[PDB]
Design a protein around this ligand. Structure first.
Ligand code: CN3
Ligand code: CN3
Ligand code: HEM
Ligand code: HEM
Ligand code: CN5
Ligand code: 6PH
Ligand code: 6PH
Ligand code: 9PE
Ligand code: 9PE
Ligand code: UMQ
Lengths: 352, 126, 55, 431, 352, 55, 126
């Protein structure tokens, strides 16, 4: 039941209730996604309809976001209305109705929409694959519900019980007065929630190297590499991602995307090469790997990464990385690889 | 077209009152037995006119097993009616079985519809 | 498809008088409408033939 | 909470944000796509891309700087972002890009490569970005043979005929001191920036004034780009709206908020207090729609855009939408106006109180170029709260009721009826 | 142009033109499938319709079958009508029209059907996967056309030119007088075909071991193992396949299917475990592998295999016959593994 | 949908004379049909009113 | 009504005959120019009545590029017609461009339909 808030003389404020219940904690494939979609549906005392109509009248909006680590309930509104939004978000964690008709009429269809959109983006499929082969159960769990594993209404409710606890969440506020936020949170049903366990793991996750998986897909082809990174080794991978996607590297024009997904217990570096032509993907990926294997100096990209890492001002509980002033060289060692698309004409891990 | 919300409000008021209850329930019991729908294998909730948005919402939300059973009772009743007979006594719906299985779905839909109508016409008092 | 369904004129006849899905339990009281159609026909035909001799 | 602005030849505008961990410095010119002609159309987009060129970006990256550039219709920006302590390094880069040098970036190799890239981007936009492509054509038809009709990215035809001389020619006519404003946003001190600029001499380069053209004019019309091979129908429809600084600038934006935006796939979007939603959800008339009130220097566009797979009911989608618009003139309710006020404040707040310095730099620069200052969010909120039902009705009575419309569409638009059937729906029969 | 036949005093005869143009030889993914579907369509002198109506009056039917190694054009008819069918089959290889409208109106839809039917059968998915990870580019080619690799009309005609050559096909006949068959084959356009080159590789195919691929799928889950086998080790895997599937093995009730696909240059042993419950699939595959690693005595299954192998044989081109007598023991070494279905709850090659 | 389309009676009027898709190039010769409908109406109306006074 | 197979048979006979070719072709050329369809931007094949199975088969088999081109000529012709004007001289279809682009598709469809009819009615002589 952590509560933080930065203040400002603005007219708009944002409230966030971050719950450690992302896909990494999903008991069954897709339950975290379904729960995310259930957020803001009817609560025992207020319907989804009334919530929307009331919030429009006072000037505010709600949204529930899902990522590998969290399920974030966010509210954006006019500053003086803080108490209303604290209670609204609290009511979601404490008393959502979870009616069977809501699952069939709103939740499932909406989750199908999310999947359908993602299904047509080969890089997202490649990313899911990278997580799966590098970590397996846990961090490698699928982000979205695709129905391969049946998830019932009860499964969704059970996951809510497992994840919606006082010890498993952090309340954050932007352009909000901390003193009041703390007072309102203590008066809300948030403090009435059971004080379970923090699902956050301290130890480093088990990982795998030299793994590969191929997926046939109609559309653009993608070749991607994933690398599990240590808590201490994450600063050099951050600079690497920015360096690789900056004008400082000759191969930036060869990569579609590169980034470092950071968690409290480590991270995952992902690099994607996407193009409609399988030959172009093959040449690009082969060149990238060969170049990285030969190694390079990341020192020139230090000041640049500092700037880019800082453009993430919205985040409150951001992982501090004063490790930047120590990174210099990088040499590509072992990694994981996934081919998606015209697989019969894409490189195999063996060839790299 | 009297709402079920209105019907329940009046009915509950009667059931909760020891005086009115002992005075009305017996007449209601006789009314139902004379209605004769149970002799056709039907439950009262099967008799509700369904050609309206509230009932369509209710029936859509009715769980599958109960929906299949309601379907059978309706078909069987039409067959019995066209033959101008009543079902065999053992197939009659027993008083204990004449349960308001659809009523809760109906009341829920009516409450939601009522709220939407109120919200669609809310006045703001500055 | 069958001609009674395909043909522009026959399709109406088929739709109203041949394939029209009827509730299995309607009783003889539901026969009055057809009788009213018969009555209208009887009146119009007898009327026209009598009109030929009326002033 | 305030915005400072000083002058000494060069107009400097800053907006200090303590909660910011970065700073942005740049120059915004009061010229954009609407200052180009049909034949050099895309020259500004060309400038943007050479500024963001790899050679130039590498120099900036070495110094821990990030480059940004936005080409709009009335304005044009070139921004450099850095940590608060490196604001000086940003100005040194900015000085090298415009003052110190202005032909190093225009080498045969760099120009040809950049030109080749933008040509690819524009071809992509034209072949794949249907909603935005349709909105661009709305402008093209609505303001045809007028400055505001030119697409910001330029056209493939004019783009491929562009040479270095066109870039230099445009730069000489528009990249002038009298048409610029140096902006500073994020964690920055007004004094530090004004003194760092004043540090260098550079005074002789000025005096010149930009070229003048013809006035933008709205013309009821339509452009139809039917493509039966696309899975949906995408259309944008609008009337002549309000220019920036119009007395009805906020009333027009509030009216647009009354009908707002919608996404059929988002559960909460379907629950909005928008009466139009009751009519369109029954047979699912569309996948999404968004109402807008686009304001520019000379004119504006008020209307909506929509995408739909319901190709046999487009006539109903358009009919119901326009019938709702009719209500703004005769029956819009007090509650609808109140709901819109709240949501308008929320949208304005999210636009102006973003945590992004480059967004603030663009907004600040663009506004100080037109009115010599940036209206406070506080004063905007007060104007919004003062809007009455009578104000909305008077505005719609002149802007919407029985007025000409501009229409643009692509995809499966066979079901989109002729112009007059649509135009007739801009009013209702009365006694 | 091998021509052989076995006669008998019957009413019905069958004729086959085996062509080495199965998926293993497919230039692009699915082209062999498309060519197989194009067989019996219009020829330059006779439409598909006339061929059907004419052969019906005579008393015969045509069929074109595709497998990993062959594209087989078969005819079943009344004995005395042999010459008609010899010429009919010859006309297909020599002069099919390949009209663009035939590709759109008949070939593609028919291939689309074949795919959709196979797509819902996870063992067939697993089998394609097994072939893919073990052999890759060669025999690892997808059996059917799925559209990941665009195949044009010209590609189909190019493949026909590549595969429809005299040195690349074998003519077989059952209940047919060989003397007459050879005469008709020589008089037919089958002799006017360009004498290209046999595509049959005499050397042993390149293979891989310890490879795995995981495929998410809604439906029954399947865990399969594939083992590349030499021409010499062929007989021992034949008895193994039959053993594991017979009542002699106490694990036959744990496996859905087990077989040995024989080719002239080697083969692939495949074993499949299928069930709606992933927990059952997990248990079974783990036990099967554990027991096979423990070693097994296949001697008792020798007489059974001779019987089963004999019934399986019918074509006048069956593999190594007398080789069974020397089989004895078996111990599972290295192999390839594929998981299809509820992959998040299926075993990994690691734990096998 | 619009009332002119959903209503059982108006949907006929709408399909025949409001939303009916017409070839953009039909000329004035295609106006004779509507004229024939007008003629029939003129004849029936004037005829009925004269019938009231006819023997 | 008259099949294109029949039109071609008669036409080819005239064309392959030096005598008839010199006597008929010039008349045909004047007939076509007086027809005036080219003045509306149309090719003769655009004029063929399409509301029959043969033509629908032909049009479906017409390659995309030519199909889009035919669509444009038909639409432009309707617009020009409704304005009661002819297209500017430079937009007229030239004799060299008035090619029978659809004819081969029509002849192929007719030949297939003729054979189907023959096969559907074949007689067996025992
Ligand atoms: C002067 C102008 C009218 C002249 C024409 C009128 C003709 C029809 C009007 C009568 C009518 O509609 O009565 C319907 C009433 C309902 O009956 P239900 O559907 O429940 O039948 C089940 C039946 O056994 C099925 O039996 P089923 O089809 O097997 O045969 C039935 C019966 C039908 O007879 C008729 O013609 C119909 C009345 O045929 C017979 O076996 C009779 C042997 C002589 O049948 C009755 O039970 C009659 C109730 C008497 C009320 C009459 C009031 C009139 C003032
Ligand atoms: C006779 C007793 C029965 C009474 C019924 C009368 C009903 C009218 C019958 C006439 C008819 O159907 O003629 C059609 C013929 C075809 O025309 P189009 O489609 O090719 O026109 C293109 C127009 O310029 C569009 O032009 P627009 O629409 O802009 O105005 C057209 C014109 C229409 O006039 C009419 O109402 C029809 C005559 O209005 C004027 O400009 C007239 C100025 C006073 O119109 C013509 O162009 C005339 C050609 C000669 C026909 C002679 C009739 C033989 C008896
Ligand atoms: C719904 C249709 C009709 C009804 C209800 C109806 C009713 C009547 C009635 C009640 C009478 C008086 C009968 C009597 O007491 O003698 C009558 C007379 C007459 N009706 Fe009709 N009629 C109908 C249609 C027609 C039509 C279409 C004609 C065609 C002209 C017609 C022609 C006559 C004539 C000539 C008489 C006078 C001879 C007589 O009294 O029967 N009727 N009608
Ligand atoms: C299709 C529609 C009709 C046509 C083509 C038609 C035609 C005619 C013609 C040619 C005449 C002779 C006019 C003369 O030379 O004076 C006539 C007379 C008459 N018609 Fe009709 N008529 C039609 C419908 C009707 C109807 C529905 C009635 C209803 C009773 C009617 C009642 C009469 C009467 C009373 C006369 C005698 C008075 C007169 O001569 O004008 N007609 N009609
Ligand atoms: C420029 C002129 C302006 C002046 C105005 C005066 C002229 C009047 C305009 C109205 C004209 C309508 C005449 C056509 C008519 O009534 O026939 C309708 C036949 C229905 O057939 P359908 O078009 O295939 O429609 C759909 C129906 O076939 C489907 O069947 P269902 O759902 O049962 O509905 C059926 C209609 C039944 O009634 C009849 C008799 O057909
Ligand atoms: C406007 C008037 C309203 C009246 C509505 C009454 C409807 C009854 C009409 C009878 C049509 C029967 C057709 C049966 C048929 O086609 O089946 C034919 C068989 O028809 C017959 O056997 C002849 C039956 C004789 C019925 C006598 C007609 C009575 C005339 C008086 C009615 C005046 C209105 C197909 O039979 P199948 O199904 O065994 O192959
Ligand atoms: C039996 C059939 C024979 C007649 C066939 C010809 C059809 C002509 C019908 C005319 C209806 C016009 C309605 C216009 C409308 O609703 O649009 C209304 C506007 O109507 C008007 O302004 C009135 C125009 C005056 C109409 C003249 C009456 C014609 C005299 C009758 C001749 C027939 C006997 C909607 O207009 P808006 O599109 O601008 O919003
Ligand atoms: C209120 C007025 C009445 C309402 C009109 C609707 C009710 C119509 C009921 C009438 C029953 C009579 C139908 C018989 C006609 C069916 C045969 C037919 O349409 O064949 C027609 C040809 O008909 C004619 O030439 C004249 C028809 C005149 C009918 C005069 C009563 C063939 O049309 P067909 O459907 O075969 O078109 C080919 C599609 N490939
Ligand atoms: C020879 C002629 C044969 C007739 C062919 C039919 C041609 C139809 C042309 C008629 C045009 C007139 C239509 C006006 C009526 C439309 C309004 C309507 O239907 O409202 C109706 C109610 O109508 C009535 O009560 C009386 C209608 C009598 C009309 C008598 C002329 C509302 O109907 P609604 O569509 O809203 O559905 C009800 C909800 N279950
Ligand atoms: C058929 C037998 C003869 C019947 C008599 C003829 C009928 C005449 C009807 C005349 C006018 O009916 C009248 O039409 C005008 C459109 O022209 C309508 O006007 C409506 O659309 C016009 C635009 O076109 C708008 O300017 C106006 O503000 C709006 O109210 C008006 O509200 C209606 O009241």
């Amino acid at each position: 039941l952590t509560v933080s808030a930065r203040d400002a003389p603005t007219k708009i404020s944002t409230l966030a209730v971050k719950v450690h219940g992302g896909s990494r904690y999903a008991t069954k494939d897709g339950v975290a996604h379904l729960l995310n979609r259930f957020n803001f549906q009817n609560t025992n005392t207020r319907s989804a309809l009334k919530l929307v109509r009331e919030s429009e009248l006072l000037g505010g909006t709600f949204k529930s976001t899902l990522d590998r680590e969290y399920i974030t309930l966010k509210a954006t509104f006019l500053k003086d209305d803080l108490p209303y939004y604290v209670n609204a978000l609290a009511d979601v964690l404490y008393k959502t109705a979870f009616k069977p008709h809501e699952l069939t009429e709103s939740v499932l269809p909406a989750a199908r929409y999310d999947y359908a959109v993602a299904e047509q983006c080969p890089v997202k499929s490649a990313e899911d694959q990278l997580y799966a082969i590098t970590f397996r159960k846990g961090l490698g769990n699928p982000l979205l519900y695709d129905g391969v594993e049946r998830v019932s209404l009860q499964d969704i409710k059970d996951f809510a019980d497992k994840v919606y606890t006082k010890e498993n969440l952090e309340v954050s506020g932007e352009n909000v007065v901390e003193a009041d936020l703390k007072r309102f949170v203590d008066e809300s049903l948030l403090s009435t929630l059971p004080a379970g366990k923090s699902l956050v793991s301290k130890s480093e996750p088990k990982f795998f190297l030299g793994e590969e998986n191929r997926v046939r897909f109609i559309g653009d082809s993608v070749a991607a590499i994933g690398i599990p990174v240590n808590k201490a080794s994450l600063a050099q991978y951050e600079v690497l991602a920015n360096y690789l996607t900056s004008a400082l590297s000759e191969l930036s024009g060869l990569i579609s995307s590169a980034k470092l997904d950071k968690f409290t217990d480590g991270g995952l570096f992902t690099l994607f090469v996407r193009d409609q032509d399988s030959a172009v993907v093959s040449s690009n990926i082969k060149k990238i790997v060969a170049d990285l294997k030969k190694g390079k100096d990341l020192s020139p990209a230090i000041n640049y990464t500092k700037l880019k890492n800082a453009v993430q001002n919205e985040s409150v509980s951001s992982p501090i990385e004063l490790n930047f002033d120590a990174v210099k060289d990088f040499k590509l060692g072992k990694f994981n690889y996934v081919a998606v698309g015209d697989v019969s004409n894409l490189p195999y891990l063996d060839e790299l | 077209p009297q709402s079920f919300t209105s019907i329940a409000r009046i009915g509950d008021y009667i059931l909760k009152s020891p005086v009115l209850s002992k005075l009305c329930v017996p007449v209601a019991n006789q009314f139902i037995n004379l209605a004769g729908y149970k002799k056709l294998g039907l439950k009262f909730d099967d008799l509700i006119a369904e050609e309206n948005p509230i009932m369509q919402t209710a029936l859509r939300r009715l769980p599958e097993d109960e929906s299949y059973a309601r379907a059978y009772r309706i078909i069987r009743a039409h067959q019995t009616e066209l033959t101008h007979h009543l079902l065999p006594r053992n197939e009659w719906i027993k008083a204990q079985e004449d349960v308001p299985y659809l009523l809760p779905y109906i009341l829920e839909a009516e409450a939601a519809a009522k709220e939407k109508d109120e919200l669609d016409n809310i006045e703001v008092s500055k | 498809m069958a001609f009674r369904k395909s043909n522009v004129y026959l399709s109406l006849v088929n739709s109203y008088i041949i394939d029209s899905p009827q509730p299995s339990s309607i009783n003889y009281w539901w026969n009055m409408g057809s009788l009213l159609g018969l009555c209208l026909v009887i009146q119009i035909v007898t009327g026209i033939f009598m009109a030929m001799h009326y002033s | 909470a305030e915005v400072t602005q000083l002058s000494n030849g060069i107009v400097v505008a800053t907006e200090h944000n303590p909660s910011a961990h970065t700073a942005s410095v740049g120059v915004v010119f009061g010229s954009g796509a609407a200052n180009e002609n049909p034949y050099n159309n895309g020259v500004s987009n060309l400038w943007k891309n050479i500024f963001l060129s790899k050679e130039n970006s590498a120099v900036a990256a070495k110094e821990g700087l990030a480059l940004s550039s936005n080409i709009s219709r009335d304005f044009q920006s070139y921004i450099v972002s850095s940590l608060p302590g490196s604001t000086d390094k940003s100005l040194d880069f900015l000085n090298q890009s415009f003052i110190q040098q202005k032909a190093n970036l225009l080498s045969s190799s760099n120009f040809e490569a950049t030109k080749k890239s933008v040509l690819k981007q524009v071809q992509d936009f034209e072949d794949n970005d249907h909603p935005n492509r349709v909105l661009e054509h709305l402008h093209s038809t609505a303001f045809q043979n007028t400055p505001l009709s030119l697409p910001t990215r330029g056209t493939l035809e004019s783009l491929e005929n562009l040479v270095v001389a066109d870039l230099e020619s445009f730069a000489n006519n528009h990249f002038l001191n009298s048409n610029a404003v140096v902006v500073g946003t994020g964690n920055i001190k007004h004094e530090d920036l004004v003194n760092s600029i004043e540090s260098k001499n550079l005074s002789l380069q000025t005096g010149t004034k930009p070229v003048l053209k013809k006035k933008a004019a709205f013309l009821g019309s339509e452009v139809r780009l039917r493509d039966d091979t696309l899975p949906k129908a995408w259309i944008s429809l609008a009337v002549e709206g309000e220019p920036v600084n119009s007395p009805n600038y906020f009333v027009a934006k509030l009216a647009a908020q009354i009908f707002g935006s919608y996404n059929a796939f988002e559960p909460a979007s379907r629950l909005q207090g928008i009466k139009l939603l009751d009519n369109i959800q029954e047979y699912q008339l569309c996948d999404n729609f968004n109402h807008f009130s686009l304001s520019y220097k000379d004119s504006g566009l008020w209307g909506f855009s929509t995408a739909t797979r319901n190709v046999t009911m487009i006539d109903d989608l358009i009919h119901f939408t326009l019938k709702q618009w009719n209500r703004l003139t005769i029956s819009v309710t007090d509650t609808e106006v109140e709901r819109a006020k709240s949501l308008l404040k929320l949208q304005l707040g999210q636009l102006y109180e973003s945590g992004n310095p480059v967004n603030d730099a663009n907004l600040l620069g663009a506004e100080v170029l037109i009115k010599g200052s940036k209206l406070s969010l506080g004063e905007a909120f007060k104007k919004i709260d003062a809007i009455t039902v009578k104000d909305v009705k008077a505005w719609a009575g002149k802007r919407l009721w029985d007025q000409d419309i501009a229409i643009a569409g692509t995809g499966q638009i066979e079901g989109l009826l002729d112009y007059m059937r649509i135009r007739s729906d801009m009013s209702m029969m009365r006694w």
